[PDB]
Ligand binder design. Structure first.
Ligand SMILES: *[C@@H]1O[C@H](CO)[C@@H](O[C@@H]2O[C@H](CO)[C@@H](O[C@@H]3O[C@H](CO)[C@@H](O)[C@H](O)[C@@H]3O)[C@H](O)[C@H]2NC(C)=O)[C@H](O)[C@H]1NC(C)=O
Ligand SMILES: *[C@@H]1O[C@H](CO)[C@@H](O[C@@H]2O[C@H](CO)[C@@H](O[C@@H]3O[C@H](CO)[C@@H](O)[C@H](O)[C@@H]3O)[C@H](O)[C@H]2NC(C)=O)[C@H](O)[C@H]1NC(C)=O
Ligand SMILES: *[C@@H]1O[C@H](CO)[C@@H](O[C@@H]2O[C@H](CO)[C@@H](O)[C@H](O)[C@H]2NC(C)=O)[C@H](O)[C@H]1NC(C)=O
Ligand SMILES: *[C@@H]1O[C@H](CO)[C@@H](O)[C@H](O)[C@H]1NC(C)=O
Ligand SMILES: *[C@@H]1O[C@H](CO)[C@@H](O)[C@H](O)[C@H]1NC(C)=O
Ligand SMILES: *[C@@H]1O[C@H](CO)[C@@H](O)[C@H](O)[C@H]1NC(C)=O
Ligand SMILES: *[C@H]1O[C@H](CO)[C@@H](O)[C@H](O)[C@H]1NC(C)=O
Ligand SMILES: *[C@H]1O[C@H](CO)[C@@H](O)[C@H](O)[C@H]1NC(C)=O
Ligand SMILES: *[C@H]1O[C@H](CO)[C@@H](O)[C@H](O)[C@H]1NC(C)=O
Ligand SMILES: *[C@H]1O[C@H](CO)[C@@H](O)[C@H](O)[C@H]1NC(C)=O
Ligand SMILES: *[C@H]1O[C@H](CO)[C@@H](O)[C@H](O)[C@H]1NC(C)=O
Ligand SMILES: *[C@H]1O[C@H](CO)[C@@H](O)[C@H](O)[C@H]1NC(C)=O
Lengths: 135, 599
């Protein structure tokens, strides 16, 4: 199975990884454009662990060429910006976050990005997401 | 059954399709996780046997009915987590048996009111989390007087529209009661006049409460007559936002007596709202995650004793001079500012870490305008160029340059005037020691962390000759290959020495003589064939010697040393797992060398 949308310049699909198949109906509105978009990624799930201390492992792969591991902090534990950080294991999370992609001048045909949400506190996998961005 | 995370102590039965609690889990277990299981009804005398259980996770277990006497056996329980069970109605005696509880979490249990909530006999309780429910009443229940230890109450993501003089009429008759309270995400629109008149709170959290600055301004005004040690304010980046945040709203906060005022992410921010006159006589000013970009409109009458700037958006270093400012923190900064001269008479704590920050011309009175400086943190920054020698800042006793690119320190004698520094960390500042007097002047130094740098010709020079008062010294990961002669010879007071992860091939026992005070010598992970040089010479104060993961030559040439391994068995760490390095050895456990072949 998979889930996708078509931009006027890119098609983004995603499905759960090959081992961590924990739920999340993630989305976006409007569908992201490779070259600049202002919008809202919409989240709706039920976390297996406390979200305070959330961060992401972003393993990108452009044109079938793996990039360096990139860690992305979402919640620090002290007065986070997003409302969801305060969310507890088992809690229902239904929120929509605003973002601002600047835009790649000359973006190439094939993109890949796998995400692992990690509970910073207990180093435990929270969910895994596998994305594909085609031009 | 489950997952044994700590034998006879902690178990993980999260998401196992279990329908009842397992039956063959020890009675010694202290922590059990049963979240995400169809438990449905928490039967009576379920956890009867678990007399040492202190923490029980039942997060999202589809629990609809807490049966009578459910908590029977759990008189030692202290953490009870019930997030996301549809147990809408709690009949009295819900929490009977939990005679030791400090923490009840009934988040998203569909909890309607606190008056029905049967917790009044929970005398041990400290924290109560009731966020994400259907609580309409900001009433603080009368049974709270009994709850003599309960000091935190969160009611976030509930529906509370009105704080009324009666809601808080309990904090009134009880001024002696220290209570923190959070009602973020409540759609508050009306606070009754003179409501907070006469009440003290330690901390109060109001985030994402206000639809309009007008609803806000008006409401904020009636907080009048309240003492708050810490009031946090602002909103979320994903919730009911403000259209315009005008400095005017804070009017009325000019009644509420405040010690610490914390601002967080606002949708619309003016670099001036922080200058506002109702913030004049505050002792502690905190900004976290603020759309602030510049800060210099700070009047000299503002009675600030501390300032905290975290995860903010400054494009140039602030430029201030508040007379009574004791502590200053500026950390985790969006962009990459650069140091900028500032005069703070009362400054005794400077915290400047984790900003892509560059500083050139460090450091002296002029740089900061005080002598009283004891703490100084400059770690996790960029290019710190060493110019002057801390001249005028003698009272400084904590210097931290971790992972920040220090420049020109091998050049001069940088720390030359720091006769009181106790703690210096220059770890992973990517440094090469040429100069011999680098640490010259640090005669009060005790702790010297300096790992992952390097040395000229990978030889350990004589930079430690004057660092007499050293007790902790860390040369781990320093690509070392050799140690020069009288290197460690003055450290008649050192307790701990780390030379792990280097390239030492042997150890000259003579080096560590004169270390009359040494307890731990870590020489793990090295290319250490053996030691040589009177094995009796090692300090008789050394108790933990670490030679793990090495490469010990079990040759006859080292007969003496191989015996030393025995005489001093108990003092080496994991001696029993040490394996030889040389000829046919693998299955050949070091402590097994004999005494024959050629010798
Ligand atoms: C009334 O009760 C409050 C809440 O228990 C007391 O304030 C608390 O004071 C301690 C410090 O003495 C805080 O400890 C904290 O530990 C964390 C470690 O995670 C550390 O990072 C913090 O810097 C801090 O040291 C505790 O969190 C704090 N509670 C709150 C919510 O502010 C207070 O002592 C009592 N009031 C009075 C006036 O005595
Ligand atoms: C001497 O200095 C070294 C180097 O800094 C210290 O080595 C450290 O050893 C500990 C365990 O002995 C390491 O902790 C480890 O954490 C990782 C986290 O994933 C984990 O995989 C391991 O199971 C382990 O718990 C620590 O990281 C390691 N230092 C580094 C950065 O390599 C040693 O402790 C020092 N001895 C002292 C202080 O006397
Ligand atoms: C070599 O052995 C020592 C002690 O057996 C280990 O250091 C201990 O570990 C922690 C982690 O840094 C310290 O807090 C303790 O102070 C140390 N214990 C004592 C009594 O000194 C060290 O980790 C070992 N070497 C390695 C890298 O494994
Ligand atoms: C892709 O674009 C077409 C344009 O007609 C639109 O109708 C369609 O909904 C899009 N696909 C998706 C995301 O369903
Ligand atoms: C676990 O605890 C029980 C209870 O005392 C004990 O009898 C048993 O031997 C322990 N199991 C082991 C061997 O770890
Ligand atoms: C060397 O150490 C002594 C210790 O008393 C100190 O007084 C002196 O400043 C240091 N260096 C010299 C010789 O100036
Ligand atoms: C996504 O990445 C995974 C690694 O988790 C890989 O096995 C798979 O081929 C990729 N699938 C997609 C979305 O093309
Ligand atoms: C968010 O998710 C909930 C289910 O948890 C749903 O009922 C609600 O309508 C959603 N919000 C929106 C986008 O309307
Ligand atoms: C408690 O567990 C023990 C096994 O360790 C067993 O003897 C007893 O029947 C159990 N009691 C109940 C009713 O839960
Ligand atoms: C609190 O405890 C005292 C003594 O047991 C008692 O007087 C009071 O009524 C209790 N409050 C309730 C009913 O929770
Ligand atoms: C505040 O805005 C919300 C929409 O987010 C709306 O439902 C509510 O009625 C507004 N309050 C008023 C009366 O301005
Ligand atoms: C600080 O502001 C208060 C208003 O609460 C005022 O009474 C007082 O005069 C001011 N103190 C100073 C800076 O002299």
């Amino acid at each position: 199975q998979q889930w996708f949308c078509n931009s006027s310049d890119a098609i983004i699909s995603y499905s759960y990884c090959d081992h961590l198949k924990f739920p999340i109906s993630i989305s976006s509105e409007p569908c992201i454009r490779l070259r600049g978009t202002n919008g809202f990624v919409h989240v709706e799930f039920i976390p297996r662990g406390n979200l305070k201390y959330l961060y992401f492992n972003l393993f990108i792969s452009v044109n079938s060429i793996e990039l360096p591991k990139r860690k992305e902090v979402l919640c620090h534990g002290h007065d986070d910006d997003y409302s969801f950080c305060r969310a507890l294991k088992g809690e229902t999370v239904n929120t929509s976050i605003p973002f601002s992609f600047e835009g790649i001048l000359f973006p190439k045909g094939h993109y890949r990005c796998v995400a692992e949400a990690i509970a910073g506190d207990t180093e435990e996998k929270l969910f895994c997401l596998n994305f594909t961005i085609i031009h | 059954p489950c997952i044994e995370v700590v034998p006879n102590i902690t178990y993980q039965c999260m998401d196992q399709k279990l329908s009842k609690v397992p039956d063959d889990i020890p009675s010694s277990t202290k922590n059990i996780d049963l979240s995400f299981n169809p438990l449905k009804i928490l039967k009576s005398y379920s956890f009867s046997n678990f007399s040492e259980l202190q923490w029980l996770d039942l997060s999202r277990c589809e629990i609809e009915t807490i049966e009578d006497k459910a908590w029977h056996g759990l008189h030692h329980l202290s953490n009870l987590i019930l997030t996301g069970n549809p147990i809408q109605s709690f009949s009295p005696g819900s929490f009977s048996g939990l005679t030791s509880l400090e923490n009840l979490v009934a988040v998203e249990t569909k909890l309607a009111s606190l008056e029905s909530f049967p917790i009044g006999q929970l005398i041990t309780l400290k924290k109560l989390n009731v966020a994400h429910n259907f609580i309409h009443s900001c009433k603080l229940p009368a049974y709270f007087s009994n709850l003599t230890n309960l000091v935190h109450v969160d009611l976030s993501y509930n529906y509370i529209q009105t704080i009324t003089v009666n809601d808080l009429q309990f904090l009134r008759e009880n001024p002696q009661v220290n209570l923190s309270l959070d009602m973020s995400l409540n759609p508050i629109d009306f606070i009754q006049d003179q409501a907070f008149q006469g009440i003290k709170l330690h901390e109060l959290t109001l985030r994402g409460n206000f639809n309009s600055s007008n609803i806000m301004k008006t409401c904020l005004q009636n907080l009048a007559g309240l003492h708050v040690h810490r009031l946090i304010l602002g909103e979320f980046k994903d919730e009911r936002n403000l259209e315009i945040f005008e400095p005017s709203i804070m009017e009325g906060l000019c009644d509420v007596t405040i010690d610490e005022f914390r601002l967080t992410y606002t949708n619309d921010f003016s670099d001036d709202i922080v200058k506002f006159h109702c913030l004049a006589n505050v002792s502690a000013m905190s900004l976290a995650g603020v759309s602030i970009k510049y800060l210099e409109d700070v009047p000299k009458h503002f009675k600030w004793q501390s300032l905290s700037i975290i995860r903010c958006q400054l494009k140039q270093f602030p430029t201030l001079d508040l007379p009574f400012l004791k502590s200053l923190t500026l950390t985790m900064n969006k962009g990459s500012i650069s140091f900028k001269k500032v005069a703070l008479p009362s400054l005794s704590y400077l915290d400047l870490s984790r900003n892509a920050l560059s500083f050139s011309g460090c450091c002296s009175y002029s740089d900061l305008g005080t002598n009283s400086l004891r703490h100084l943190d400059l770690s996790f920054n960029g290019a710190i160029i060493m110019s002057a020698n801390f001249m005028g800042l003698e009272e400084l006793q904590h210097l931290d340059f971790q992972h920040s690119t220090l420049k020109r320190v091998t050049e001069f004698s940088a720390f030359l005037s720091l006769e009181k520094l106790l703690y210096l960390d220059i770890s992973y500042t990517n440094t090469k020691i040429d100069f011999d007097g680098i640490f010259l002047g640090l005669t009060s130094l005790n702790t010297l962390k300096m790992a992952g740098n390097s040395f000229k010709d990978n030889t350990l020079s004589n930079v430690f000759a004057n660092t007499t008062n050293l007790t902790f010294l860390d040369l781990s990961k320093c690509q070392l290959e050799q140690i020069s002669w009288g290197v460690f010879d003055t450290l008649h007071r050192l307790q701990l020495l780390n030379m792990s992860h280097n390239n030492l091939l042997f150890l000259d026992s003579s080096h560590y003589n004169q270390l009359y005070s040494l307890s731990t010598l870590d020489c793990s992970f090295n290319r250490i064939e053996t030691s040589k040089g009177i094995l009796q010479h090692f300090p008789k104060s050394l108790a933990f010697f670490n030679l793990t993961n090495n490469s010990v030559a079990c040759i006859c040439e080292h007969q003496k040393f191989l015996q030393w391994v025995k005489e001093q068995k108990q003092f080496l760490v994991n001696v029993e797992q040490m394996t030889c390095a040389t000829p046919v050895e693998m299955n050949t456990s070091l402590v097994l060398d004999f005494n024959n072949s050629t010798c």
